Write a protein that binds this ligand. Structure first.
Ligand code: CDL
Ligand code: PC1
Ligand code: PC1
Ligand code: PC1
Ligand code: 3PE
Ligand code: 3PE
Ligand code: 3PE
Ligand code: 3PE
Ligand code: 3PE
Ligand code: ZMP
Ligand code: C14
Lengths: 106, 151, 446, 107, 48, 85, 161, 81, 134, 144
């Protein structure tokens, strides 16, 4: 080889990309389409779709309801977090003779 | 108002920052915007797990979902109260030992009530498990006195 | 999940049409794009159609499995150029993707078991067909028999739970609870072997070193997550027996992960060190599962997804240097920075992801799984600090000794890095740093 | 012992000339497929690391290594975890601590 | 420098850890920037 | 820096003429250090160490046995400095 | 056909002399001539020449599209201050535009897109109380928002609900 | 000057240019859509619920892109429930 | 084309002990006049024991090596550019065949250099065929 | 070449098998030294290295592989990881025994801990009575 070949390289001699080692046409389609369906679609358009996703898990609504329940409970004498799951008058409270020897767990 | 040259320079830099953004809002962003209405979403009260039967599964779903939603609502109750305490700490920078003690008292009472309702249930907290916890806790305060006294 | 399953079912006849490998990869990345746009799932079971539905847990697991299989086609180009049964390989990948989607979309536990045992067969086909060493026969037999020996009495457990409850649905089984020791051991030992505990890991490095990268990535990124997702389904109704018998598994899975981390410091094989790295971080996952705290389950699911991504990414690097240097070791592959300087950036960006990397999802999974173990007991602090210290002692030795120092001076001329390999490394790292902005889809499954 | 050093030097010279012939080959480099020159020591080291189990016998030294290396820290660590959690569980279930003075409320 | 920036501007322990691990990793990398066994052992020492 | 063979020759002959155990006369590049001159076995270590503190690199023991004249001293220095002109 | 190395065949020609210890031990004079010719080969009389095809392949059209208005400014001022001095003026105008755009974008976000009470995930600014020296307006001053509900409002007090 | 022996960095630069091309080819329609939604159709304003009005499942969300996604693409929470 | 031989002589051992002792001595004493005075003192100490026979010379060599192990400096002075220094192998030069894997557009920057490289590849394959055979 | 072809075989138990094993490993017959078969031994593998390090080997020898300091068909040492240039290898032998460094360091630390915590209750102080603060109701007086 001579210095005229290296100074003016050949179009027909092509360094192959990683996809297809048989045809130059098959690389220049596979790189473009694989970069389109991964980088443009999944990582940019998919990230844009996720950025403007609605409250599928209720977190912003739970924050709004947290402000509203702190607004109403500070107005009345009811405490800010209820200690009990339901009202204790609805609790049946079975007697000690009815329980006998039963495991009570706190 | 320009007491010091540093404050006058800061006012000038803040005016240069403030001008184009409020021009772009009031001239471009605030025109051509339509007036749509969105509402805070409101929920009814499904019947609680007390009224649910043993074999019924259509109502255990509703009771478990309202238990999860009430757990979420109490979670940002405690979170908002913690941010109220932190804003008290930042705003009263040299005197947070006096102003933030009642806010810390409400925060500690809220954490105690939150652990009394939701504590030790675990990752899989159904509406059944909290009701069994409340029944066993009320049985313990009926027989053995309050929790932490003894017995 | 009928649209995804029928999409792959009519993606099946593209294997029999020649020169369509990259077309199957393009449409599988399109499936991942559509499944990115299907996110609306919450706690309970949504999008219910013909016993198929998902929660946020199953949504993240299907999304991870779809991402790993599409990357696996991108990773396996040596099948395409040598024409080494690419149609059979594509059909194996698509059928195994159907089986993993179907075992993750299961509303009842018996579809999870049935397609979980069905997924062992194309992985065994990948091991026995597309490896490179004579110990392929030792590898797939260890995988098949270590899975089957503990997964066969769990079928008896499943039918015992079905007779007692009458259904396999995951919400109707949440109401009941059982106080039987042998039922607990059947429903736990299969997941305790399938995701490797220290005493039962053996099959993992044998299955990983022998396996082809399209076969090691489906063992590292997923299919250890079957043994975590199974406990995420099963521990809900066996809480009392778990409180009776957790401490032996927590002690074993915390001593292992220190001993396992000391093993990787004394090994020379590149693929075996990542194989033992899969044991140590999912030792943290296994320790965090059997503490039934809410942070434990959330951080466990986060470290499952993120550890699958970084372990598949680390097994991507171990085959790029293997096909250029002929055989992988620490001694042959010493100091590849002077050979491939641009590959070294992904080498550190994924080896740092194996330890606590600061903006990745691995740290966020690890920072909340340590919370449950510390809140469980204070005795566990001593063997966690040694665990993470030896963890970043071994996983920085990988990048350290493979990507720094003098060259081997006995190697021949190999090809440089290509566009495919950098794109392959990018889609393992930038999902680790981009899903932290919406980590609640990978934290909150409850 | 001098003739042993001379024989080792002759073997080292033969291996050095073999390395200089094979590592600097035009025709092996010109194929384009990368790899490694044929080294026996690396292959023996790799198969010693992989195929080591067939030289393992049940011996009291090996049993002592497996006992005080793996099983014994597992046993003491499980005993410590069980003892600490049993004491804390007895304290928690007896009723000796309150709901406001309790560690790790997850809040 | 960016890792140092994040480590100063952060009150939270979680974001101080974000600064901390990144500062340690890039400090390790620029200890082992020189290609010799002394800097290799040096990077191992500062990383641990 | 930039070196040539004449500069190495001038440096080696300069520091050898600065040595007092050797006479400045009867000194040549082809002269043997052992039998042509009066230096013993231990003075060769001093000559090798003078080469080390001049040229900035240390010389091993077997390479010190290999060097017996100023000519291969110049050849040994020119090998590491890689001048070859 | 595809050539990852071109038509030129990959081989080593430097020999064993690139190692440090193989030169200091004895060696052939023909090996010395080969090493001398190798070192004379590695010297370059001229620097790397500018080729247009590598720059065209290493420039996607979007970057050329958004670099062309600054490239016109570089091309007009090229003969006046020289090529090297005008490229600094071209470079530090576009980066000044990037910094100004980032500063105005951060100002607009932190003034009108703060973390409101209706959502989670904005940059929630909490500010401390400014000091008041003598010479300021209202020097005898108690701190405001002393009601407990006024702390951490995030716009809840102005809500229409 | 002296010829420094370095590996080929054409492939890394080509990967960087292709990645920048496809990132920009994604972002520019995304930037156009975000600017069109934030400028021309605008966000929604919070208001009280009327007594005789039952709001629909996409009217509980502020952004118009979130309203579009919930109304057209995603199913409602009520349907899954 | 010779490699160093692994045997060691008594003359080699005394010479290596003398060189290592003077290296430790100049690491202990920084100034050159004090180092030269102590070097003449060590020269007298090593010249006084020349007249002894082989067994006493071996015993004195072992005692001198043991004592030099006892009095060895914690940081001996070593040349940084040589082996054992800080600046040893600061950069690693890759073998030249990575220059064979450049792009042709990247090869177009040095066309005369790559044509000269092709000429030396022909010369090297001729040299390898006439040296190591076929 | 695979792992089943090149593999450490059984323990030799014979001088002839020892000679054939030394010829197999490119190791001179005097050089070969097999591991004792104690259950954790290596059958048919030489015991090489095991000094104070691979860094103890001379770097001035023209090694075929200078990054490991080894020849071409020289067999790898059995614990080559632990004795490598990364971990637990020194150029010169250490000056003292291993217990001396830890003993001197722990003695210095024990002395400094004892001296500091013995002097913890007696601290230096300027002649200053008490810092003065306006709590409500001090009625505190000056000396005027
Ligand atoms: C000359 C005039 C002065 C200089 C310019 C001033 C700043 C620009 C103002 C402007 O564009 O206002 C229009 C408009 C103002 O809307 P608005 O009425 O204030 O709020 C609408 C919603 O209520 C609130 O919803 P929002 O989504 O508009 O949120 C506020 C906005 C605020 O954004 C900004 O202010 C500019 C962005 C930089 C913020 C830096 C913060 C530090 O933030 C974003 O848009 C976040 C980025 C988009 C989601 C992530 C996906 C990115 C692409 C995929 C990867 O702002 C935008 O459209 C911003 C678009 C930013 C993203 C562009 C693409 C990036 C890639
Ligand atoms: C496993 C398989 C993974 C496949 C690839 C996934 C690619 C898409 C990732 C989408 C995540 C994401 O970034 O969401 C946008 C995220 C999520 O949107 P978000 O703001 O609604 O986040 C959820 C809400 N909080 C904040 C409370 C957690 O957007 C942002 O964080 C806004 C800024 C985006 C740009 C940041 C700088 C980028 C350079
Ligand atoms: C091997 C040991 C097998 C023990 C089988 C005991 C089964 C049993 O108790 O059934 C009766 C009981 C029956 O429970 P029951 O409540 O229906 O009792 C009925 C009682 N009568 C008849 C009086 C009405 O089964 C159970 O309690 C549940 C057992 C479920 C699993 C059965 C198979 C166990 C296999 C153990 C596998 C362990 C995993 C590791 C394997 C490693 C390789 C071996
Ligand atoms: C050009 C792109 C501009 C995007 C933009 O405007 O972003 C603004 C946004 C914030 O504005 P935003 O969140 O209000 O914008 C999104 C709004 N919605 C949801 C309506 C679309 O993002 C940022 O400022 C980037 C923050 C990155 C923080 C990374 C944290 C990593 C933590 C790691 C350590 C802890 C681990 C545990
Ligand atoms: C798990 C795998 C189950 C069995 C799959 C068998 C087919 C695998 C395959 O991809 O075969 C490709 C092969 C190529 O053709 P070949 O046989 O080499 O010779 C040409 C002669 N017609 O053969 C063919 O292309 C022949 C195609 C017809 C035979 C297969 C028919 C469908 C088999 C089930 C496909 C769906 C799998 C389950 C869902
Ligand atoms: C294969 C994987 C194997 C994984 C490990 C075993 C898993 C199953 C363990 C079952 C035992 C267990 O955890 O029992 C829990 C029980 C709790 O104790 P508790 O109920 O409080 O009763 C009071 C006890 N005095 O604890 C007890 O009742 C205490 C039991 C004490 C007796 C233990 C005997 C162990 C014998 C050695 C086994 C390990 C070594 C084997 C040989 C190794 C050779 C190298
Ligand atoms: C698969 C391949 C083979 C694998 C082998 C390795 C298996 C590792 C896993 C082991 C599983 C756990 C074994 C038991 C651990 C301890 C369990 C436990 O909780 O023990 C508590 C018990 C308490 O003792 P006690 O004094 O009775 O209690 C008083 C309390 N007021 O304490 C005791 O009972 C202590 C006495 C028993 C200790 C047993 C230790 C065994 C060590 C190995 C022995 C090997 C054979 C010799
Ligand atoms: C790729 C790297 C670059 C990434 C993009 C960076 C863009 C520029 C970010 C910094 C911009 C700082 C200057 C502009 C904002 C402040 C202007 C200002 O004073 O706004 C007034 C506003 C309200 O004050 P007023 O209501 O007047 O009382 O005052 C306030 O709201 C007070 C609080 C001001 C906070 C200033 C901004 C802080 C930094 C935000 C960084 C966001 C990105 C973080 C990324 C982390 C991971 C890398
Ligand atoms: C340039 C090259 C790349 C182009 C890529 C274009 C992608 C366009 C976006 C596609 C997103 C699809 C996401 C999805 O699964 O949407 C499901 C959705 C269901 O719609 P539906 O249930 O009717 O909604 C009302 C209920 N509230 O919507 C649909 O099912 C509608 C789409 C049906 C497509 C049928 C194709 C045959
Ligand atoms: C700080 C202080 C460190 C000082 C370290 C060195 C102190 C050691 C001095 C103690 C005395 C010795 O060790 S002398 C060692 C043995 N010397 C001999 O010359 C051995 C007897 N001589 C011979 O065998 C000689 O014939 C040859 C064969 C050495 C003759 O000399 P060549 O001409 O060099
Ligand atoms: C009247 C307002 C119309 C707003 C349209 C917004 C469209 C957003 C589409 C987001 C999903 C894109 C998927 C490719």
């Amino acid at each position: 080889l001579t210095t005229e070949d290296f100074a003016n390289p050949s179009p027909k001699n092509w360094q192959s990309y990683g996809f297809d080692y048989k045809d130059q046409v098959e690389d220049r389609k596979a790189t473009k389409s694989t970069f389109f369906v991964t980088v443009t679609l999944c990582l940019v358009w998919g990230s844009f779709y996720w950025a403007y996703l609605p409250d599928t898990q209720f977190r912003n609504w739970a924050q709004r309801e947290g402000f509203l329940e702190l607004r109403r409970r500070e107005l009345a004498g009811v405490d800010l977090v209820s200690p009990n799951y339901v009202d204790p008058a609805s609790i049946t409270l079975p007697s000690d003779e009815d329980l006998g020897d039963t495991e009570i767990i706190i | 108002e320009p007491r010091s040259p540093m404050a006058s320079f800061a006012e000038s830099v803040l005016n240069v920052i403030d001008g184009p953004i409020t021009w772009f809002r009031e001239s471009i962003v605030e025109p051509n915007q339509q007036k749509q209405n969105w509402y805070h979403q409101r929920f009814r009260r499904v019947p609680t797990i007390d009224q649910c039967y043993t074999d019924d599964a259509v109502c255990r779903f509703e009771a478990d979902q309202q238990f999860r939603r009430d757990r979420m609502v109490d979670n940002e109750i405690v979170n908002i109260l913690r941010q109220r305490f932190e804003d008290c700490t930042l705003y009263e920078a040299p005197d947070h030992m006096v102003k933030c003690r009642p806010l810390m008292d409400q925060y500690e009472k809220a954490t105690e009530n939150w652990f009394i309702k939701y504590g030790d249930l675990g990752g899989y907290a159904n509406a059944k498990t909290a009701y069994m916890k409340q029944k066993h806790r009320l049985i313990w305060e009926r027989r053995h006195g309050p929790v932490g006294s003894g017995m | 999940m009928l649209k995804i399953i029928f999409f792959l079912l009519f993606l099946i006849p593209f294997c029999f049409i020649n020169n369509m490998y990259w077309m199957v990869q393009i449409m599988m990345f399109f499936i991942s794009f559509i499944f990115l746009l299907m996110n609306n799932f919450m706690n309970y079971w949504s999008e219910i159609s013909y016993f198929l539905g998902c929660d946020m847990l199953s949504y993240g697991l299907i999304l991870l499995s779809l991402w790993i299989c599409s990357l696996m086609l991108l990773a396996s180009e040596m099948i395409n150029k040598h024409n080494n049964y690419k149609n059979l390989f594509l059909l194996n990948i698509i059928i195994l993707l159907l089986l993993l989607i179907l075992t993750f979309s299961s509303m009842s536990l018996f579809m999870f078991y049935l397609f979980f045992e069905s997924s062992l067969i194309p992985t065994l086909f990948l091991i026995l067909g597309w490896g490179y060493q004579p110990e392929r026969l030792q590898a797939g037999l260890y995988l098949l028999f270590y899975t089957l020996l503990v997964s066969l009495p769990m079928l008896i457990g499943i039918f015992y739970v079905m007779n007692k409850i009458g259904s396999m649905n995951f919400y109707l089984m949440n109401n009941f609870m059982f106080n039987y020791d042998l039922l607990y051991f059947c429903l736990l030992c299969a997941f305790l072997v399938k995701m490797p505990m220290f005493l039962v890991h053996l099959w993992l490095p044998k299955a990983h070193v022998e396996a082809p990268v399209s076969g090691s990535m489906i063992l590292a990124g997923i299919m250890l997550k079957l043994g975590g997702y199974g406990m995420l389904r099963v521990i809900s109704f066996l809480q009392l027996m778990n409180l009776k018998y957790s401490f032996v598994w927590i002690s074993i899975s915390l001593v292992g992960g220190v001993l396992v981390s000391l093993v990787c410091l004394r090994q020379t094989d590149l693929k075996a060190l990542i194989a033992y790295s899969s044991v140590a971080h999912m030792g943290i996952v296994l320790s965090g599962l059997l503490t039934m705290t809410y942070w434990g389950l959330c951080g466990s699911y986060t470290l499952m997804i993120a550890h699958g991504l970084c372990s598949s990414g680390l097994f991507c690097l171990a085959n790029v240097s293997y096909e250029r240097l002929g055989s992988r070791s620490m001694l042959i592959n010493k100091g590849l920075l002077n050979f491939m300087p641009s590959m070294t950036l992904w080498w550190f960006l994924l080896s740092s992801a194996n330890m606590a990397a600061p903006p990745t999802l691995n740290l966020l999974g690890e920072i909340s799984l340590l919370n449950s173990i510390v809140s469980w007991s204070w005795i566990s602090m001593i063997l966690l600090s040694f665990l993470s210290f030896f963890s970043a002692a071994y996983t920085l030795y990988l990048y350290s000794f493979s990507q720094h120092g003098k060259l081997f001076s006995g190697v021949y001329s190999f090809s440089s890095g290509k566009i495919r390999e950098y794109l392959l490394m990018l889609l393992h790292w930038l999902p680790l740093n981009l899903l932290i902005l919406k980590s609640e889809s990978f934290m909150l499954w409850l | 012992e001098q003739e042993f050093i001379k024989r080792k030097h002759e073997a080292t010279l033969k291996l050095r000339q073999e390395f200089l012939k094979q590592s600097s080959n035009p025709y092996r480099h010109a194929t384009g497929e990368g790899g490694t020159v044929f080294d026996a020591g690396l292959a023996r080291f790799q198969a010693m690391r992989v195929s080591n189990y067939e030289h393992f016998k049940p011996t009291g030294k090996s049993f002592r290594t497996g006992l005080f290396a793996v099983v014994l820290p597992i046993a003491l660590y499980a005993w410590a975890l069980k003892a600490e959690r049993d004491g804390r569980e007895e304290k928690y279930r007896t009723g000796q601590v309150a709901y406001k003075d309790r560690q790790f409320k997850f809040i | 420098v960016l890792s140092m920036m994040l480590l100063i501007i952060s009150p939270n322990l979680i974001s101080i850890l974000l600064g901390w691990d990144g500062l340690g990793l890039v400090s390790y990398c620029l200890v082992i920037y020189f290609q010799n066994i002394k800097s290799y052992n040096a990077g191992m020492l500062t990383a641990l | 820096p930039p070196l040539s063979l004449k500069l190495i020759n001038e440096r080696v002959l300069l520091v050898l003429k600065l040595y007092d155990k050797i006479d400045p006369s009867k000194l040549n590049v082809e002269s043997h250090f052992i039998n042509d001159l009066g230096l013993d076995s231990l003075d060769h270590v001093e000559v090798i160490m003078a080469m080390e503190d001049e040229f900035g690199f240390e010389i091993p023991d077997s390479d010190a046995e290999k060097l017996l004249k100023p000519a291969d001293i110049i050849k040994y220095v020119a090998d590491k400095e890689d001048v070859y002109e | 056909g595809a050539s990852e190395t071109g038509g030129v065949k990959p081989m080593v020609i430097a020999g064993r002399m690139v190692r440090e210890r193989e030169r200091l031990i004895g060696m052939s004079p023909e090996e010395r001539a080969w090493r001398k010719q190798w070192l004379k080969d590695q010297e370059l009389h001229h620097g790397p020449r500018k080729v247009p095809a590598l720059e065209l392949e290493l420039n996607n059209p979007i970057k050329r599209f958004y670099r062309a208005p600054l490239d016109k400014v570089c091309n007009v001022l090229e003969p006046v201050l020289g090529f090297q001095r005008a490229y600094t003026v071209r470079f530090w105008t576009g980066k000044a535009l990037l910094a100004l755009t980032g500063i105005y974008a951060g100002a607009y976000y932190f003034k009108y897109n703060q973390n409101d009470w209706t959502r989670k995930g904005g940059w929630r600014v909490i500010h401390s109380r400014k000091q008041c020296v003598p010479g300021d307006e209202g020097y005898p001053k108690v701190s405001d928002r002393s009601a407990p509900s006024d702390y951490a409002a995030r716009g809840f007090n102005e809500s229409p609900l | 000057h002296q010829m420094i022996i370095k590996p080929s960095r054409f492939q890394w630069d080509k990967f960087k240019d292709l990645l920048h091309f496809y990132v920009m080819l994604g972002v520019i329609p995304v930037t156009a859509l975000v600017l069109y939604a934030n400028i021309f159709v605008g966000p929604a304003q919070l208001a009280e619920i009327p007594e005789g009005y039952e709001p629909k499942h996409w009217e509980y969300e502020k952004h118009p892109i979130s309203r579009f996604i919930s109304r057209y693409i995603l199913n409602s929470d009520q349907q899954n429930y | 084309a010779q490699v160093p031989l692994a045997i060691v002589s008594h003359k080699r051992q005394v010479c290596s002990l003398y060189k290592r002792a003077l290296r430790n001595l100049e690491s202990w004493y920084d100034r050159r006049n004090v180092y030269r005075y102590r070097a003449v003192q060590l020269r007298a100490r090593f010249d006084e024991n020349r007249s002894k026979d082989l067994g006493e010379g071996i015993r004195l060599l072992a005692c001198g090596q043991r004592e030099l192990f006892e009095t060895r400096h914690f940081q001996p002075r070593n040349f940084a550019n040589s082996a054992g220094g800080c600046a040893f192998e600061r950069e690693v030069i890759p073998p030249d065949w990575v220059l064979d894997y450049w792009h042709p557009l990247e090869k177009a920057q040095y066309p005369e250099y790559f044509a000269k490289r092709e000429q030396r590849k022909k010369e090297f394959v001729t040299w390898w065929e006439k040296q190591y055979g076929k | 070449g695979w792992n089943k072809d090149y593999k450490p075989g059984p323990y030799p138990q014979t001088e002839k098998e020892r000679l054939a094993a030394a010829k197999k490993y490119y190791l001179l017959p005097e050089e070969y030294k097999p591991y004792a078969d104690d259950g954790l031994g290596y059958g048919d593998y030489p015991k090489l290295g095991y000094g104070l390090g691979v860094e103890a080997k001379d770097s001035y020898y023209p090694w075929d592989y200078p990054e490991h300091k080894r020849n071409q068909h020289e067999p790898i040492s059995a614990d080559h990881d632990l004795y490598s240039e990364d971990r637990w290898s020194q150029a010169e032998p250490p000056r003292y025994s291993n217990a001396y460094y830890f003993a001197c360091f722990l003695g210095v630390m024990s002395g400094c801990l004892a001296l500091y915590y013995w002097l913890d209750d007696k601290k230096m102080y300027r002649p200053v009575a008490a810092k003065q603060y306006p709590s409500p109701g001090v009625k505190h007086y000056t000396f005027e």
